[PDB]
Enzyme design. Structure first.
Site, PDB file in Angstrom:
ATOM      1  CG  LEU H  43     -12.930 -31.225 -21.176  1.00  0.00           C
ATOM      2  CD1 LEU H  43     -12.849 -31.923 -22.138  1.00  0.00           C
ATOM      3  CD2 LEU H  43     -13.943 -29.869 -21.509  1.00  0.00           C
ATOM      4  CG  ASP H  44     -18.449 -29.833 -16.746  1.00  0.00           C
ATOM      5  OD1 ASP H  44     -17.748 -29.550 -17.728  1.00  0.00           O
ATOM      6  OD2 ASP H  44     -19.476 -29.416 -16.724  1.00  0.00           O
ATOM      7  CB  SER H  45     -20.144 -34.988 -15.585  1.00  0.00           C
ATOM      8  OG  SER H  45     -20.841 -34.045 -15.111  1.00  0.00           O
ATOM      9  CB  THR H  48     -16.790 -35.881 -20.266  1.00  0.00           C
ATOM     10  OG1 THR H  48     -16.039 -35.037 -19.285  1.00  0.00           O
ATOM     11  CG2 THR H  48     -15.687 -37.066 -20.907  1.00  0.00           C
TER      12      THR H  48
END
Ligand code: 3PE
Ligand code: 3PE
Ligand code: 3PE
Ligand code: 3PE
Ligand code: 3PE
Ligand code: 3PE
Ligand code: PLC
Ligand code: PLC
Ligand code: PLC
Ligand code: PLC
Lengths: 10, 257, 53, 45, 65, 80, 77, 88, 69, 132, 105, 128
Positions: H43-45, H48
């Site tokens: 999961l990227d930023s 997230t």
């Protein structure tokens, strides 16, 4: 349960 | 004065019920939210609370046969029965308030009970009715919100009923022209707008909710914001009247004392 | 207690006392509305005077 | 992708929260009122 | 009967106000509910006498001003 | 069964019956039995049905008399 | 005693200033405007209301000598 | 009786359901208490953020920015929810 | 449960879920006390109250109006 | 976005008392820790000379819109309810009385309304029923 | 301070900006199915500007973003009851636990 | 109460009890400032109600209902208007009519039983 204790005699 | 006293007595029954049945829902949800935007799909899980709100709202909405009907319909019609300039203006204000009463009652019922669930799934598996001590006063007030107005109507609203504590000057008696001279269209006009308008509002939520995404339109957002902030009265009171009231004391403190 | 993932929420198992009491109060209101409407629909809507039996 | 939470939001329109179940019983005891009123009308006769 | 309707809730206020420490949480709530109920039954009795029989009650405790 | 307005009550009989001032009019004669019946029956909607209907109809005739007067008043106002 | 209050220096500085506002007060144009309003303008307004209605309001048991309600009605058509 | 309290067993169960129902989690990606968002679940930023906004909605809380940026594993999320007096 | 600090904070109303050990004994005394002078309110009320519409006959009032005329 | 309340000076001069920009403490981030969490204050933070107007105990400062906009919206609303009233009054759109207003016998119940003699009839009389 | 894209201080500023965007959408849109459509539209607008190097472009975008967020802000946001601003906030706070200091007064 | 002064005693202590009920959760900053808001707006109405009672003593010499209500027809219209304008302002504060209605929604800070009582058969109906 809550079982709220009884305070001293008043 | 007789109509005001009677509506005063009847309102105390079904408005106490509405507050009681609101506190029932707030306690039942384990998050103890008070925002209807976080409610939805409560009708099945708390059917007794829904019934109290439903009957109390219908009593509030002056549905024919109920206690609010015998006290509120006559008051609204008495505005037109005055046949003065002010009476005619206030009749429309009362008529809109009667129509708005149905609108905010259906909106409150839809969001809390009939909407798709907005709360977490964990809330709905724990959503249970409260004990019998909470329930008992609501049932007693529920019956008073059904029959009570019909029983007590003749004491306060009967023609010629002696209530000398509430003095009415002979020049000001309008109960008769209210009861005999109004058109039959106005006798049911509050009922049509409230019931007809309420159904239209209910359909939009269930089927065409895209019209209520008012954040899109800037004019709708400003019109929504004006009423949600209560005609901006609280801001005007605090920021202008209360601020300048305290500043006068400061100016007296600084420049005089 | 244990939490079941993914399982949907079925129709609740509301205690029979809560359901029957709710339907008695609601049925009591609807009966009264229909009972009053039958004998007062002309009087209510201005289609007949109360003394015109 | 399209609606990443689609599988999470599924329960909100299934089970007790279908359009049929949510509005079913929205008028509490409506037909019981008609039934008791119907008994009153027939018994009066 | 008139003194019962008026001052009984005031006695319930005093009991839960000063004797709440001595009768506990449970009995304080119900004794106050008892005082209001006495006013309920007294009021209903007076309602029949006043509205239906045209009887007025007046109790003059003492002079104020 | 009230066809026209009854005979007006005298001033003394209004004082004896303690009729409200706003209801000391042409129909005060029919009000005396009704307020007497209302008190005995606890003002319940089912008790004094006939006496209540008679008095309501009397005010209807007094109202229709006042409807006729205003038409008469306008005719004098229109033609003057 | 045992110093039961946790003395705050910023509170003491702020409180000491509020007691000693007189030291820094200047009778400038802003101060003169407020002095005139509070001690001359407003007292004059009450001064003229007090002596204007000095003995001009005999309101004890004041009677009604004029009718309130109209006898005849005139339509607007 | 109300909801029978909130132990870490329930908190973890209601967190796994979020990640199991969030298809943006990379394929494979066994969901474990020590699993991280960026590495284990991919999961990227921004993803997230979406997971933690569903986290605060699930337990009916509002997560400050200063504390959402420090939640980077499932176990850290579980410990955080248990460290909140008003999580339901 | 929590900490109520009941060691020294003893207000007349109780202070955070206070029910004394001898609460049943005191409740009966207060119920006796409440009932005893609740009857005292009734006994006083029946003696002191009166009907202000029956104190003077209508014939007595006619003389008042004429004499004060 | 967020603006200070009214009657807050932009400068002051009180000797050596520290000079600071006025901060309305009601707007502070409530998710931060403070030595005084309820007041959102840390120990020994300098106070503005009018800090009592810029803290929790001061009246709440609503700032969703500017005061002029709120005052413009407030006047706009009640202006409509006055235009609606004025259109009907000048045009005379309100209905006429369907019947002559109620009248009463005995010279409009003059005696029953506290009239002494014939000199004070119309002083106390209700509308008079000219038709006996 | 100037903006350095792909920095740690940039991954916290955009993340918080995205939170306020979704919360504002949640306050305005009270149906879950309608919220998901708006939630994805907001996210895709973030994805378009995700790969931008020039800080002189980002600060123009960042300033504009706050203009939209402040303009679309709901006057009555949704707040949990026990959170700051909630209906139960600061209700029945447990008393401070500290031994009383006796005094002779 | 048989006269207006006895009514005013109940009028004030309703505001006293409403203040303590709205600010019942006094550790909550919102409930504390809401109880003050309800008390001060009603105390503004009380100040007008006192003036109306002072004017009633000036014109009629009494506050008793039996005395004042017998003189209603024979008193000057302006004197009657002054007294009841003072009564009207006091009525707006308690009944939350427009102008003095701001405290009414702040009163929701109290426990729901307070709302069920204050807003149904109580303080909001005192002005009526
Ligand atoms: C009771 C007595 C009422 C007296 C009313 C006095 C009105 C008044 O003096 O308003 C002046 C005040 C602005 O005065 P000031 O703060 O000195 O402005 C210069 C700042 N650079 O403006 C205010 O403080 C607002 C006062 C308006 C409310 C009256
Ligand atoms: C009740 C005492 C008996 C009343 C006389 C019997 C009766 O017929 O009335 C029953 C009454 C409903 O009847 P209603 O329409 O109000 O008037 C009489 C219709 N013949 O029933 C009721 O009014 C019930 C009211 C709620 C209890
Ligand atoms: C009655 C007598 C009226 C005397 C009025 C005195 C006016 C006065 O003293 O004003 C104060 C002034 C000092 O100036 P300040 O207050 O600091 O503010 C000015 C900023 N440009 O003071 C001055 O300008 C200095 C002159 C003071 C003269 C005082 C005279 C006293 C003699 C009569 C006493 C009575
Ligand atoms: C701390 C307390 C301070 C103690 C000092 C205060 C002393 C009070 C004054 C003592 C007066 C003695 C007395 O009670 O006289 C009895 C009086 C008889 O006088 P009488 O002329 O016959 O009655 C005329 C009424 N129209 O009879 C009366 O008229 C008194 C009846 C008045 C009733 C008013 C009720 C007010 C509220 C009572 C609450 C307390 C009573 C309940 C007791 C506990 C109940 C559980
Ligand atoms: C005569 C004109 C009015 C005189 C104004 C006097 C200056 C103000 C005096 C009160 C000082 C303010 C105060 O005591 O504390 C602030 C208090 C808090 O209120 P607030 O923050 O708005 O409530 C939010 C709760 N969450 O704020 C208050 O609640 C004060 C309540 C108002 C005080 C009386 C004002 C009556 C105004 C009536 C006219 C309104 C327009 C019509
Ligand atoms: C709050 C303030 C405290 C209460 C103050 C009450 C002030 C109202 C005074 C009543 C009054 O004077 O009414 C008369 C008023 C103007 O007086 P005027 O027209 O000169 O004399 C009428 C003679 N028929 O004319 C009017 O009747 C209408 C204008 C005043 C009505 C109240 C607003
Ligand atoms: C008779 C009155 C007719 C007008 C009422 C329509 C229903 C309504 O006001 O609703 C329609 C909408 C709002 O949608 P909502 O359902 O109220 O809330 C849902 C909104 N969300 C989902 C965005 C949170 O109103 C408005 O923004 C209009 C301004 C409010 C005042 C109403 C008119 C004032 C005159
Ligand atoms: C806290 C600080 C308070 C200070 C004291 C307050 C009381 C002030 C009293 C003012 C009285 C007033 O205004 O009286 C007015 C008088 C004269 O009025 P005129 O118009 O000339 O005559 C009136 C005749 N008419 C009405 C027919 C025109 O004026 C004076 O000669 C006041 C002299 C002293 C003040 C300068
Ligand atoms: C018409 C006149 C009525 C007279 C009788 C009315 C009942 C008297 C109640 C006394 C006991 C009580 O309330 O004071 C004692 C209680 C104590 O709080 P607790 O609930 O025990 O919780 C204990 C937990 N603490 C310690 C956190 C609170 O309150 C307080 O100190 C709260 C502060 C407000 C003071 C309230 C005074 C009310 C006086 C009324 C003014 C007219
Ligand atoms: C403030 C904005 C609200 C709307 C303004 C109404 C405009 C208007 O024209 O209203 C005029 C009205 C009506 O009374 P009238 O026309 O003087 O007399 C009419 C006499 N009848 C009725 C016997 C025929 O009085 C008011 O407003 C009442 C006072 C202000 C209340 C606020």
């Amino acid at each position: 349960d809550h079982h709220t204790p009884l305070g001293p005699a008043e | 004065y007789n109509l005001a006293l009677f509506h005063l007595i009847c309102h105390s029954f079904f408005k106490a019920l509405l507050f009681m049945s609101a506190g029932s829902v707030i306690h039942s949800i384990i998050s103890e939210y008070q925002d209807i935007r976080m409610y939805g799909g409560f009708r099945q899980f708390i059917p007794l609370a829904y019934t109290c709100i439903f009957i109390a709202s219908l009593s509030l909405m002056a549905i024919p046969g109920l206690t609010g009907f015998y006290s509120k319909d006559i008051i609204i019609e008495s505005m037109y029965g005055e046949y003065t300039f002010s009476g005619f203006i206030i009749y429309w204000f009362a008529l809109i308030s009667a129509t708005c009463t149905s609108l905010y009652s259906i909106r409150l019922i839809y969001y809390t009970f009939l909407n798709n669930p907005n709360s977490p799934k964990y809330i709905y598996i724990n959503l249970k009715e409260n004990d019998i001590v909470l329930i008992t006063p609501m049932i007693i007030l529920t019956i008073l919100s059904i029959f009570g107005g019909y029983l007590l109507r003749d004491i306060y609203l009967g023609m010629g009923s002696p209530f000398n504590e509430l003095f009415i000057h002979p020049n000001n008696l309008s109960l008769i022209e209210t009861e005999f001279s109004l058109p039959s269209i106005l006798k049911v006009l509050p009922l049509i707008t409230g019931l007809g308008g309420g159904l239209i509002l209910l359909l939009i939520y269930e089927f065409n909710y895209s019209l209520f995404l008012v954040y899109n339109n800037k004019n709708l957002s400003k019109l929504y914001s004006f009423f949600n902030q209560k005609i901006m009265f609280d801001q005007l009171l605090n920021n202008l009247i209360l601020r300048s009231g305290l500043n006068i004391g400061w100016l007296l403190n600084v420049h005089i004392d | 207690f244990k939490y079941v993932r993914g399982a949907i929420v079925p129709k609740p198992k509301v205690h029979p006392g809560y359901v029957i009491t709710s339907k008695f109060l609601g049925g009591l209101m609807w009966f009264w509305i229909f009972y009053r409407a039958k004998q007062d629909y002309p009087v209510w809507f201005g289609l007949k005077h109360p003394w015109e039996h | 992708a399209g609606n990443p939470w689609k599988r999470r939001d599924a329960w909100r329109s299934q089970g007790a929260f279908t359009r049929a179940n949510r509005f079913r019983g929205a008028l509490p005891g409506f037909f019981w009122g008609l039934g008791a009123f119907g008994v009153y009308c027939v018994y009066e006769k | 009967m008139i003194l019962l309707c008026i001052f009984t809730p005031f006695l319930g206020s005093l009991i839960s106000g000063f004797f709440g420490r001595y009768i506990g949480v449970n009995s304080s709530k119900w004794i106050v509910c008892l005082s209001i109920f006495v006013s309920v039954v007294s009021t209903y009795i007076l309602f029949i006498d006043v509205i239906f029989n045209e009887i007025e009650y007046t109790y003059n405790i003492m002079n104020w001003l | 069964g009230v066809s026209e307005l009854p005979e007006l009550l005298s001033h003394e009989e209004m004082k004896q019956n303690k009729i409200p001032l706003a209801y000391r009019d042409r129909c005060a004669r029919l009000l005396v039995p009704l307020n007497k019946c209302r008190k005995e029956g606890w003002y319940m909607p089912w008790n004094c049905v006939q006496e209540r209907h008679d008095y309501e109809q009397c005010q209807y005739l007094d109202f229709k008399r006042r409807v006729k007067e205003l038409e008469e008043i306008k005719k004098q106002r229109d033609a003057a | 005693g045992p110093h039961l209050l946790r003395e705050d220096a910023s509170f003491q500085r702020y409180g000491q200033l509020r007691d000693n506002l007189a030291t820094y007060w200047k009778f400038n144009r802003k101060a003169a405007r407020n002095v005139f309003i509070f001690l001359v303008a407003v007292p004059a307004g009450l001064g003229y209301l007090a002596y204007n209605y000095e003995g001009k309001t005999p309101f004890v048991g004041k009677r009604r000598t004029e009718p309130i309600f109209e006898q005849d009605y005139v339509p607007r058509k | 009786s109300s909801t029978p309290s909130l132990t870490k067993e329930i908190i973890y169960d209601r967190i796994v359901e979020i990640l199991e129902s969030y298809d943006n989690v990379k394929q494979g990606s066994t969901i474990s208490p020590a699993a991280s968002f960026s590495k284990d679940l991919g999961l990227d930023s921004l993803d997230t953020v979406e997971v933690l906004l569903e986290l605060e909605n699930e337990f009916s809380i509002l997560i400050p920015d200063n504390e959402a940026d420090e939640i980077k594993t499932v176990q850290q999320a579980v410990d955080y929810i248990a460290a909140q007096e008003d999580s339901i | 449960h929590h900490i109520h600090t009941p060691s020294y904070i003893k207000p007349p109303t109780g202070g955070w879920n206070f029910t004394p050990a001898n609460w049943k004994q005191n409740t009966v005394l207060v119920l006796v006390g409440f009932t005893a002078c609740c009857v005292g309110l009734y006994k006083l009320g029946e003696a002191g109250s009166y009907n202000p519409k029956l104190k003077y006959k209508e014939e007595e009032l006619s003389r008042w109006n004429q004499s004060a005329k | 976005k967020s603006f200070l309340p009214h009657f807050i000076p932009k400068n002051y001069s009180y000797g050596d008392y520290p000079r600071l920009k006025p901060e309305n403490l009601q707007k502070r981030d409530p998710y931060l820790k403070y030595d005084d969490q309820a007041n959102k204050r840390n120990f020994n933070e300098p106070l503005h000379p009018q800090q009592d107007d810029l803290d929790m105990w001061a009246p709440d400062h609503f700032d969703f819109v500017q005061d002029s906009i709120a005052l413009k919206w407030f006047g706009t609303f009640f202006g409509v309810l006055a235009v609606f009233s004025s259109v009907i009054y000048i045009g005379g759109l309100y209905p006429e009385k369907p019947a002559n207003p109620r009248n009463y016998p005995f010279s409009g119940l003059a005696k029953d309304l506290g009239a002494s003699s014939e000199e004070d009839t119309l002083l106390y009389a209700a509308k008079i029923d000219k038709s006996i | 301070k100037a903006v350095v894209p792909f920095s740690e201080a940039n991954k916290k500023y955009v993340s918080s900006l995205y939170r306020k965007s979704l919360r504002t959408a949640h306050d305005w849109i009270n149906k879950t199915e309608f919220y998901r459509v708006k939630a994805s539209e907001i996210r895709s607008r973030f994805d378009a500007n995700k790969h931008i190097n020039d800080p002189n472009e980002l600060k123009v975008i960042f300033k504009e973003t706050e203009a939209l967020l402040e303009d679309y802000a709901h006057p009555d946001p949704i707040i949990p009851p026990c959170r700051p601003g909630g209906s139960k906030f600061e209700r029945n706070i447990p008393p401070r636990v500290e031994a009383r200091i006796p005094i002779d007064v | 109460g048989d006269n207006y002064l006895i009514l005013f005693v109940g009028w004030e202590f309703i505001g006293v009890a409403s203040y303590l009920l709205i600010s019942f959760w006094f550790t909550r900053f919102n409930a504390v400032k809401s109880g003050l808001s309800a008390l001060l707006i009603n105390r503004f109405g009380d100040a007008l109600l006192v003036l109306g009672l002072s004017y009633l003593v000036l014109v009629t010499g009494s506050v008793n209902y039996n005395t004042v209500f017998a003189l209603g027809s024979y008193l000057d219209v302006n004197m009657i208007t002054v007294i009841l304008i003072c009564f009207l302002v006091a009525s707006m504060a308690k009944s939350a009519q427009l102008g003095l209605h701001s405290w009414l929604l702040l009163a929701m800070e109290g426990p729901t039983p307070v709302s069920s009582l204050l807003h149904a058969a109580c303080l909001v109906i005192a002005g009526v």
